[PDB]
Write a protein that binds this ligand. Structure first.
Ligand SMILES: CSC[C@H]1O[C@@H](n2cnc3c(N)ncnc32)[C@H](O)[C@@H]1O
Ligand SMILES: CSC[C@H]1O[C@@H](n2cnc3c(N)ncnc32)[C@H](O)[C@@H]1O
Ligand SMILES: CSC[C@H]1O[C@@H](n2cnc3c(N)ncnc32)[C@H](O)[C@@H]1O
Ligand SMILES: CSC[C@H]1O[C@@H](n2cnc3c(N)ncnc32)[C@H](O)[C@@H]1O
Lengths: 119, 119
C-alpha cells in the first residue's frame, strides 16, 4: 500500500523562529513526537523531536536551529509503506515527513501509523 | 528467541531523587531514550523517556516523580521476543524494562534491538 494513503494528513510544521519551549508545547498539544521545521516558503530544513528538546536542556542550547537534525530522512507520497517501515528501523527513527518533489511538506508517517497495518 | 538474550545488559536506572535536567544528561550521555526509575531497594516505580522531559518544560513541572509514567509496561526475561514486539506497537512505546519476579530491573529491550532480528 502507498504512503499517500496512510500519512497524517495536514502536516504540523514550524519555522525555526520559535523557542525550544514553544516547540515542546506544540508536541505536547497535538500529542506528537515529530516536528518538521520549514522555511518561509514551506520547504523542509530539519526535524525536531522530543529527543532534541532533552538535548537542549542537556547542553544548554537555546535556539531551534542549533539542534534541529539538519539532515532529515523523508518519504515520498508514492513510496510503498513497507519500504518506509524498513527505512525507519534501519535508521532507527519513528517518523518521516512526506515530501512533494520540491521538498515541501505534505504529511508525515510514524510507526504509530504503520502499526495499523500490523493488525 | 527469548528476551533474556537480546536485552541491554546492565540496566541504567535512577531513583526519583534527581532533577529533570540530570535525567536528560543521563539519556544524552548513554545515547538512550528510556530511563527506568527505581526505589531504594531497586524495584520498578516508573519510567522516564525524552517525551516526559518535554512534558516537564511544557507544563513547568519540576520533579521526576511528578512526570514519570507511574504505570510501566514491562517484559520478563523468559518472554519470547516476538511477543514483546507486538506489545510495544499495540501500546505504542519503543522500550520495556525487563523485570525479575520481584519487579527488580534486570535489563531493557528497545525496538532498536528487535530490529536486528529484522535483518
Ligand atoms: C504520534 S501518534 C498520533 C498521530 O500524530 C501524527 N503526527 C506526528 N507528527 C505529526 C506532524 N508533525 N504533523 C501531523 N501529524 C503528526 C502521527 O502520524 C500519528 O497519527
Ligand atoms: C533517533 S533520535 C536521534 C535524532 O534523530 C533525529 N530524527 C528523528 N527523526 C528523523 C528523520 N526522519 N530524519 C532525520 N533525523 C531524525 C532527531 O532529531 C534526533 O536528533
Ligand atoms: C537507544 S539505542 C542504544 C541502546 O541503548 C539501550 N538502552 C536504552 N535504555 C537503556 C537503559 N535504561 N539501560 C540500559 N540500556 C538501555 C537500548 O536497548 C539500545 O541497545
Ligand atoms: C509513548 S510516549 C507517552 C508516554 O509513554 C511513556 N512510556 C514509554 N515507555 C513506556 C513503557 N514501557 N511503559 C509505560 N509507559 C511508557 C512515557 O513516559 C510517556 O509519558
Amino acid at each position: 500500500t502507498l504512503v499517500k494513503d496512510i500519512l497524517s494528513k495536514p502536516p504540523i510544521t514550524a519555522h525555526s523562529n520559535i523557542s525550544i519551549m514553544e516547540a515542546a508545547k506544540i508536541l505536547i498539544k497535538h500529542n506528537i513526537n515529530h516536528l518538521p521545521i520549514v522555511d518561509e516558503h514551506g520547504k523542509l530544513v530539519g526535524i525536531i523531536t522530543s529527543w532534541d528538546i532533552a538535548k537542549a536542556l542537556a547542553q544548554n542550547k537555546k535556539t531551534i536551529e542549533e539542534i534541529m537534525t539538519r539532515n532529515v530522512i523523508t518519504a515520498h507520497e508514492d513510496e510503498p509503506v513497507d519500504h518506509v517501515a524498513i527505512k525507519m528501523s534501519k535508521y532507527n527513527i519513528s517518523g518521516v515527513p512526506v515530501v512533494d518533489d520540491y521538498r515541501r511538506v505534505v504529511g508525515i508517517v510514524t510507526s504509530e501509523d504503520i502499526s495499523r497495518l500490523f493488525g
